[PDB]
């Protein structure tokens, strides 16, 4: 089978920039290459067919070029909603094969997170567990770091983090950190604190509460 | 309009079989390939196989020939993909897609998720993340819902029955060491609204038939 190589798994670009994504076929496929765009939670969408033709309804900023083994997909002026994974595909020979994909990420300037903390709910405390949630909203770059302190004691092994995909309008991220405690342990301590470091923060931000307040 | 409607999510035990469907409309079914594309969680697209219902010819990527069978019903314009002897590597989203024979895939179905697991279904607990002075900055307040300890994915979360979409972040689920998933959904709203607008997170977990509408009460 024909191997389609997209040598870059990731590519970064600013809104307004031109970006090009490469795809190399292991043998000559003439012009029998298509390009697809896949955004999170969505099916792939056809953008380019026969190597260089824009598919019906595709915006003018998307083009493709190439014939033989070397193919290029180009966005002439990136828009914020163009973050997606882009895939090439050949149909010169059966079976069709896909490239490995290139994830387009959007560069922007540093934005510090807004940090908020949520004590356990009364409903959860009823059931023997206490989860504390720390929210980091609308920051850039992605590398925000959360540490938990309980009565000024650094926690380990009892928290988990999740991060959103880059926002399609402002290119920021948000992150949740959840500290999971037993109710008995939660009842042993006063101060619950989320501490955040990020390139937009000159010093760590601490958001805290006292149990029962 | 050309439409490809796929069947609902499947949870299947290892060793069992499932049969997925892709109902086509809006075009002459027998003029086109219907192919299937596999995407394991977090991974790339794999072309799986195709049928040309006009003459019955099938074509499979070699690695999938052993356990998969592609069929089509011309009378109902429906293509089927049957997966047998299911293994964890078969957990994935499977899309159907139309193309001219050996050509560009112009119309796609919405995908069917197959999850291969011996574990039992478990519905989530849903807890409020109430807005307060500690979730307020300037003129806005953050609130949310914690959706804890369910299996398998996914839960769907909406706010105010889908009316509230701006400022919502529903985070990726995280797999816990217990084998269960949790996630949180948050939304930022005007602090001026907390006393007059009700905020309800609508949580749907189809595998366990769990449906919760959790009112999130503001703290004074």
User: Sign (positive/negative) of CA torsion A91, A93, A97, A103?
Assistant: negative
Residue of A204, A4, A15 whose CA lies nearest to A108:
A15
Q: Do domains B3-116 and B125-215 have the same CATH topology?
A: yes
Alpha-carbon distance of A116 to A114, in angstroms, equals: 7
> Do residues B79 and B24 make contact, with C-beta atoms less than 8 angstroms apart?
yes
Query: How was this one solved?
Result: X-ray
Substitution target from A91, A115, A136 for chain B, most B beta carbons within 10 A: A91
Closest partner residue to A96 (CB to CB) among B47, B174, B176 is: B47
Tokens 């709203």 — which residue?
B189
Identify the H or E element spanning A87: strand A84-90
B104–A46 CB contact, under 8 Å:
yes
Residue boundaries of the structural domains of chain B:
3-116, 125-215
Q: Does A52 touch chain B (CB under 8 A)?
A: no
Model resolution, angstroms: 1.6
Query: Which of chain B's residues have a Cβ under 8 Å away from the Cβ of A136?
Result: none
Per the structure block, which two tokens stand in for B76? 């109902």
B125-215 falls under which CATH superfamily? Answer: Immunoglobulins (2.60.40.10)
Architecture of domain B3-116: Sandwich (2.60)
Rounded to the nearest 5°, which phi and psi values hold at B131? -75, 150
What is the architecture, at CATH level 2, of domain A4-107? Sandwich (2.60)
Closest partner CB to B171 (pick from A36, A46, A164): A164
Which residue of chain A is at minimal alpha-carbon distance from B36?
A96
Three-state SS for A41-67 is CCCCEEEEECCCEECCCCCCCEEEEEC
Cβ within 8 Å, pair A137-B129: no
Tell me, letter by letter, the H, E, C secondary structure of B163-189.
CCCCCEEECCCEECCCCCEEEEEEEEE
Closest CA to B149 of B179, B111, B115, B104: B179
User: Domain spanning A114-210: which CATH class is it, in words?
Assistant: mainly beta
Q: Contacts of residue A45 in chain B, CB cutoff 8 Å?
A: 108
CB neighbours of residue A169 within 10 Å = 8
Structure tokens at B8: 């609902």
Q: Is B174 exposed, middle or buried (0-12, 13-18, 19+ CB in 10 A)?
A: middle
**What is the Cα–Cα distance from B204 to B210, expressed in whole angstroms?**
6
């Amino acid at each position: 089978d024909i191997v389609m190589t997209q040598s870059h798994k990731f590519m970064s670009t600013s809104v307004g920039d031109r970006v090009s994504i490469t795809c190399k076929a292991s043998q000559d496929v003439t012009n029998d290459v298509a390009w697809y765009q896949q955004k999170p939670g969505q099916s792939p969408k056809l953008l380019i067919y026969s190597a260089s033709y824009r598919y019906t309804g595709v915006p003018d900023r998307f083009t493709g070029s190439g014939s033989g083994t070397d193919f290029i997909f180009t966005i002439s002026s990136v828009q914020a909603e163009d973050l997606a994974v882009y895939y090439c595909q050949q149909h010169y020979s059966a079976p069709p094969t896909f490239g490995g994909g290139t994830k387009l990420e959007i560069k922007r300037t540093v934005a510090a997170p807004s940090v908020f903390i949520f004590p356990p709910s009364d409903e959860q405390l009823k059931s023997g567990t206490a989860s504390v949630v720390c929210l980091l909203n609308n920051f850039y770059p992605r590398e925000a770091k959360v540490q938990w302190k309980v009565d000024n004691a650094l926690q380990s092994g009892n928290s988990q983090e999740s991060v959103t995909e880059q926002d399609s309008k402002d290119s920021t991220y948000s992150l949740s950190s959840t500290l999971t405690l037993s109710k008995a342990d939660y009842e042993k301590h006063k101060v619950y604190a989320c501490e955040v470091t990020h390139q937009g923060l000159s010093s760590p931000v601490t958001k805290s509460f006292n149990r029962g307040e | 309009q050309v439409q490809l409607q796929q069947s609902g999510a499947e949870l299947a035990r290892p060793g069992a079989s499932v049969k997925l469907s892709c109902k086509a409309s809006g075009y002459t079914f027998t003029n086109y390939w219907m192919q299937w594309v596999k995407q394991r969680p977090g991974q790339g697209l794999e072309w799986f196989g195709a049928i040309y219902p006009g003459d019955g010819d099938t074509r499979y990527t070699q690695k999938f020939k052993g356990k998969a069978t592609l069929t089509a019903d011309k009378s109902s314009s429906t293509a089927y993909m049957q997966l047998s002897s299911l293994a964890s590597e078969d957990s994935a989203v499977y899309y159907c897609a139309r193309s001219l024979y050996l050509g560009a895939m112009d119309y796609w179905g919405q995908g069917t998720s197959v999850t291969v697991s011996s574990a039992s279904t478990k519905g989530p607990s849903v807890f409020p993340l109430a807005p307060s002075s500690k979730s307020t900055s300037g003129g806005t307040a953050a609130l949310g819902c914690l959706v804890k300890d369910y299996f398998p994915e996914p839960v769907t979360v909406s706010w105010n029955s889908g009316a509230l979409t701006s400022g919502v972040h529903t985070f990726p689920a995280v797999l816990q060491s217990s084998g269960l998933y949790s996630l949180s959904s948050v939304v930022t709203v005007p602090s001026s609204s907390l006393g007059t607008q009700t905020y309800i997170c609508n949580v749907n977990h189809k595998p366990s038939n769990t449906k919760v509408d959790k009112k999130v009460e503001p703290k004074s």
